[PDB]
């Protein structure tokens, strides 16, 4: 066997529906992605690069 279950959970990133570009906060620095999608895969290499974590809430994702 070798099957991960992936089922969502109560309450999560909600992000708006619709072409948007997501504005990542980083500390002090201002960063911008296309799109949520890329947004989050890439803020969370810069949590583990400058160690800090996610924060994504709607479409802004502040590097805490």
Same mark, same amino acid.
């Given at each position: ?14 992000? =708006? ?7 990542? &906060? *980083?500390?002090? !620095? ?5 799109? =949520? ?7 969370? &290499? *810069?949590?583990? !690069? ?15």
């Amino acid at each position: 066997m070798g099957s991960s279950h992936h089922h969502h959970h109560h309450s999560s990133g909600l992000v =708006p529906r619709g072409s948007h570009m997501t504005t990542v &906060k *980083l500390g002090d !620095i201002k960063v911008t992605f296309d799109n =949520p999608e890329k947004a989050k895969k890439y803020a969370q &290499k *810069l949590a583990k !690069i400058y160690q800090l974590t996610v924060h994504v809430h709607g479409d802004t994702i502040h590097v805490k």
